[PDB]
Amino acid sequence: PAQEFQTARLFLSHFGFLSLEALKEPANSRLPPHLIALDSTIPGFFDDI
């Protein structure tokens, strides 16, 4: 049996959030796609949180 678990991808995929259409960049617009991954290495992220 398996030991480790990356439950995050399971959660994203099961609810239907994660898909090619969701990640596709919008056409002729500046709003971000339906799914966005943030960064925890850029300085000041936790301060903004």
Binding site: A2, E4, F5, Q6, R9, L10, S13, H14, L18, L20
Partner: peptide, 24 residues
Amino acid sequence: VKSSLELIPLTARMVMAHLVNHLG
């Protein structure tokens, strides 16, 4: 030697879903 959805997109979607879910 002398010698109806397209199957490829469905197979690609199934492979991506399977890899995301069951890998590991």
